[PDB]
Each structure stands twice: as C-alpha cells, then as structure tokens.
Design an enzyme around this catalytic site. Sequence first.
Site, PDB file in Angstrom:
ATOM      1  N   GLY A   1     -53.919 -36.102 -12.430  1.00 23.43           N
ATOM      2  CA  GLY A   1     -54.554 -34.574 -12.620  1.00 23.43           C
ATOM      3  C   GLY A   1     -55.953 -34.763 -12.470  1.00 23.43           C
ATOM      4  N   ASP A   2     -56.696 -35.551 -13.472  1.00 27.39           N
ATOM      5  CA  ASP A   2     -58.267 -35.432 -13.386  1.00 27.39           C
ATOM      6  C   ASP A   2     -58.940 -36.783 -13.080  1.00 27.39           C
ATOM      7  OD1 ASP A   2     -59.117 -33.213 -16.254  1.00 27.39           O
ATOM      8  OD2 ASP A   2     -58.940 -32.983 -14.059  1.00 27.39           O
TER       9      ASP A   2
HETATM   10 CA    CA Z   1     -59.125 -30.978 -15.954  1.00 28.32          CA
HETATM   11 CA    CA Z   2     -57.009 -32.614  -9.754  1.00 35.26          CA
END
Ligand code: CA
Ligand code: CA
Length: 338
Positions: free
Chosen positions: A17-18
């Site tokens: 994700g991040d």
């Molecule tokens: Ca985020």
């Molecule tokens: Ca991402």
Amino acid sequence: NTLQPTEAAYIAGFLDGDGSIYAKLIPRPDYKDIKYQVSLAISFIQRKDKFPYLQDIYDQLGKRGNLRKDRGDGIADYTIIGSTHLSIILPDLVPYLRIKKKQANRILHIINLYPQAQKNPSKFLDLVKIVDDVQNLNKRADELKSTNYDRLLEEFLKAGKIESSPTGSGSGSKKNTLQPTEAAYIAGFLDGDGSIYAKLIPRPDYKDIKYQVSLAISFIQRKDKFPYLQDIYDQLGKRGNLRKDRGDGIADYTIIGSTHLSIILPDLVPYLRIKKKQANRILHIINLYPQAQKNPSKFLDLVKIVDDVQNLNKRADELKSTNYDRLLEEFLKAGKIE
DNA sequence: GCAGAACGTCGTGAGACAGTTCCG
DNA sequence: CGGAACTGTCTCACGACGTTCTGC
Ligand SMILES: [Ca+2]
Ligand SMILES: [Ca+2]
C-alpha cells in the site's frame, strides 16, 4: 529473526500500500574501478502524526534501518537500506507480498549476484539490468523507461572497461476462507491504500428521519493494479463494488452497508492498526443502528459516531465534522426532539 | 420507504528516487 | 576505498467522501 506470520503479512500489505521497494545506482567519485555502488532499499511512507505506526513496524523488523519523524513536509518515512538488512527482512515479507513481490525478488536477486558482479564490468552491467527492471516495475506504461544499463554500457566502453564484444539484453535505442495471514495482509493494505468511513446521506423520502447513515470500507489503486483488488474482492467472499476505472485511471473496491461489514470487519479488526478505531466505530454503528432508526434521540448520538469516524479520518488541525450540530438544529426546528 | 450502486471529485498523502553528507 | 545515513523534492496516486442514481 523470528517475525510472526501475521506481522509479516500485515507489513507486506502495508508496504504494498504505502511502501516502496526500489533499486538505484549512486555515483561514487572515489571508487576503485566501477564508480557506482548499487543501492537497494525498502521504505514506508506516512503522514507525520502516524509515525508511531512506522516506529512499531521498525521494532518488529529487529530495529533495522533508519526512521524519520519528519522528512521536511510534515511527512514521515522509514527507509531500510542495504543488503545486510534486506537479506534478513525480505525473505520474511516475500511470501505475503503481492503488488511488489517482483521488486522484492529482484532486490533479493541483486544481493546474490553483487559479490561477484562487484569487480567485473560485464557482470555489473548484467546486474544493472535488474536495477532497470525494478525501476520499470515501479513505473507506469507511458513513463520513460529506465536507461541505467545503456548509459553505463556507453560509459564502460568509453572508459575502456569493456572490450568487444559487449552484451546483452537491454532496450538500447542508440462462509469464510479468510485465514490469519489473508486478513493480516488485507488489513495492512487497507491501512495503507484503503479507507474506512461513515457518512450521512440525505434521503428526501423517509418516515421521519430523512437521513441514512452509510457505512463503507474502500480500496484505491491504479487501474494496472486492478487485478490485486479483484483478488482481495474474491478473498472477502466477493462482496461489494469494483471499478476497473472510476474515470481518472484509478480503480477502487468499495464495500457498502452493515450486511457485508458485519462479516468482513471482524476478520480485519484484530490486524488493523492505523484504521482500527474507524473499524470498531463502524461495528458500533452497526450494533446500535436497529434502535436508532425510529428514535431521533438515539439517531443523534449515533450521528456523533459518524462525526467521530470522519474526525479520525482527518489531521488534528482540519475543521471537525458538524453533522451532529447540523442534525440537532434540524431536529429541533422540525419539532422532532425539542 | 428503504438502502445499496454508481458517478465524480477537492486537496493532499504519498511513492521512488536523485544527491549529498557522514563514516569504519 | 567501501556503503550506509540523512537531506530534499517532483509528480502523481490516492483517500474520504457529497451526490445521485437505481432497485425492490
Ligand atoms: Ca496511505
Ligand atoms: Ca500506494
């Protein structure tokens, strides 16, 4: 090294994700022959306020790499550089990694070839190719493609480091089945690229209270990575709505309504970190909504949970949600509570 | 009357480095 | 010499919805 399966799975979710897995070569105006060291890293990026969450991941990864509370623009990252840490960490994450699994295998591969490739320009170039794939895998389709290998083959020939004939292989243009690690990943990924939120929908045709509290979790990503959403969707029993494209090239997966979230959320809550509060609050809303529909008094303090959720989805300085203040005004002037 | 599906969208919150400073 | 840490930022890839559009 013994990092727990659901801790490894979460982190992989969160990284997918991040995070970022990437390779690069650094100019080295003091190196023996080959004036480049190939640098390798994974990182985790997040807003200043959520730093404790990064610091938590750090501590699980044997406290390797370097944390940064603020990188300059109120935003924090945790970068793990070098083959020493990564040859320990990545084996733990690779099984659970999805979106960036290839990048991870490539880094892990570069590590295997580096010792020998280090003082051989032929084997260094062949390794620089792998640095190219990684940077390409982190790119879009329309973006300029990595040319590190081409710029170094030209550099090695001009510097007399390689004789004829050169390489090689470069684009030279010269019911449930949600198990612990399944849920852990998804929670990681939702904490990264997802959203858990509540909202009041104006319904111009209701019995008394002309609003309904809408509840959702969503997953957002670029369309090329849509299949990964299509995965999570399948894994969650195929509940909710998918968009291959919402209009601006980015896809999303949205699960609306208590019915689905009564089933999904309890599976993700134990592994959720950044968004765990939002999750529980939604469950709470689900829990006391039945009675809230008829009674405007019970609807109101439930509407506070909506405000609270929306508040959590904001930094401290942003103007706090006033749905409770606006509905209180509305209910008084409609004589529904006095 | 009810509520999920689908559509569209500010305003940041990230990704993925390139440089550059330390450091045994 | 060797390589990791720390600095700094440009470019989108997200978030978290208000809206409104079906569907029984
Ligand atoms: Ca985020
Ligand atoms: Ca991402």
